[PDB]
Copies of this chain bind each other. A is one copy, B any other.
Amino acid sequence: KNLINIDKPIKELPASIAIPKEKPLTGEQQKMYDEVLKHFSNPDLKVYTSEKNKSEDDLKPLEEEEKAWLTRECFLRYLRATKWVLKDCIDRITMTLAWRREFGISHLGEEHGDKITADLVAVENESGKQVILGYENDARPILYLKPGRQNTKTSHRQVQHLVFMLERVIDFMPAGQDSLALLIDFKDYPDVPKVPIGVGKEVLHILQTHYPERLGKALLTNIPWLAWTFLKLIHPFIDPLTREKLVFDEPFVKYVPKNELDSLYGGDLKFKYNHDVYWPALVETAREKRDHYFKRFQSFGGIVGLSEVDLRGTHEKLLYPVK
């Protein structure tokens, strides 16, 4: 039958998928990067404790978990997102640090004090409306979004749930990659009892402001007829780089290995969502990844600027020693 029955996240990137080569930095880009590193490596630096309630009178230094989040690639994502405008890059990183503090995820895990816990959001995922499973052609972990399986009413918890899953998919990043792939299925799921808007604006703000360069590819399917037409109509007018991220009306297998894809979309993975099995496995797997990540961070001096290639790897010597 060729189908592979699976019910838990795939812990590692298979050796069959190579890690895409990283685009090189120009002498000047390398110079701006050093400026960002210097700024955040300042032992006296203090940052706002909140984004929404930002106050020049309430600043706090970088904690250890924050220094571990301020990585080489974190700097690069912001540098590229702000089009290498040093001042904007610094400001954005600072505001995301403030937001992570206000939102309750600045500690890199509930085990370090995060207010956003697995138990807090677990109910939101009981119908499997979001699933982390598999990796695509460019080694990007896959996040399935199935709005047609909505099981709860509009609430702020829905936002915390989304942020939690995004942070988890990020934990699943293999060494050498920092972008994810979203597979969005708009189909209606009647088997899922439907529950009987402010959240939209907060979701948008978070996605556009605090997760720069995370969208590697977006695979769309079962798009509503009318929505499809509007996408086709505006498509010729979307910036080249962005349009290349959008994939639709194409074989998903063309972008995702067959054994890494849900059979529901042409792959070989016979996946059925079972909460009492999938959720505990996801949380634990993510936990082990961050434990390793944080342990490496400490073994390398616990300083700002370390590379995620090194933090997520096991090689003895640093591939990217800090200047």
CB of A229 within 8 Å of the partner chain: yes
Give A227 to B229 CA distance when docked, in angstroms: 13
Main SS class of interface, A:
helix
Taking CB atoms, residues of chain B closer than 8 Å to A238 are: 234, 237-239
- What B residues does A207 contact at CB under 8 A? 233
Interface size class of A (residues with CB under 8 A): 20 to 34
Does residue A195 face the partner (Cβ distance < 8 Å to B)?
no
Is A264 part of the binding interface, using a Cβ–Cβ cutoff of 8 Å? no
The CA-CA distance from A228 to B227 in the complex, in Å, is 11
Interface string of A207-242 (1 = CB under 8 A from B): 110000000000000000111110011101111001
A204 is an interface residue with CB less than 8 A from chain B:
yes
Q: How far is the CA of A207 from the CA of B199 in the complex (A)?
A: 34
Q: How many copies does the complex hold?
A: 2
A200 at the interface (CB under 8 A from B): yes
Which residues of B sit under 8 angstroms from A204, Cβ to Cβ? 229, 232-233
A200 touches B229 (CB 8 A): yes
Asked if A203 is an interface residue, CB under 8 A from chain B, the answer is yes
**Across-interface contacts of A242 in B (CB, < 8 A):** 234, 237
Cβ 8 A contact of A200, one of B197, B203, B225? B225
A237 contacts which chain B residues (CB < 8 A)? Answer: 238-239, 242
In chain A between 188 and 207, which residues have their CB closer than 8 angstroms to a CB of chain B?
197, 199-200, 203-204, 207
Q: Quick check: is A257 within 8 A (CB to CB) of the other chain? A: no
A147 at the interface (CB under 8 A from B): yes
- Inter-chain CA distance A203–B230, complex, in Å, is 11
Mark out the residues of chain A between 161 and 203 whose CB falls within 8 Å of any chain B CB in the assembled complex. Answer: 197, 199-200, 203
Q: Which 5 A-B pairs have the closest CB atoms?
A: A237-B242, A237-B239, A200-B225, A204-B232, A237-B238
Q: A208-B232, A227-B227, A237-B242 are in contact. List 20 more A-B contacts (CB 8 A).
A: A147-B226, A197-B225, A199-B225, A200-B225, A200-B226, A200-B228, A200-B229, A203-B229, A204-B229, A204-B232, A204-B233, A208-B233, A208-B236, A234-B234, A234-B238, A237-B238, A237-B239, A238-B238, A238-B239, A239-B239
Using CB atoms and an 8 Å cutoff, list the residues of chain A in contact with chain B. 147, 197, 199-200, 203-204, 207-208, 225-229, 232-234, 236-239, 242
Can you show 24 pairs from A to B with CB atoms below 8 A apart?
A147-B226, A197-B225, A199-B225, A200-B225, A200-B226, A200-B228, A200-B229, A203-B229, A204-B229, A204-B232, A204-B233, A207-B233, A208-B232, A208-B233, A227-B227, A234-B234, A234-B238, A234-B242, A237-B238, A237-B239, A237-B242, A238-B238, A238-B239, A239-B239
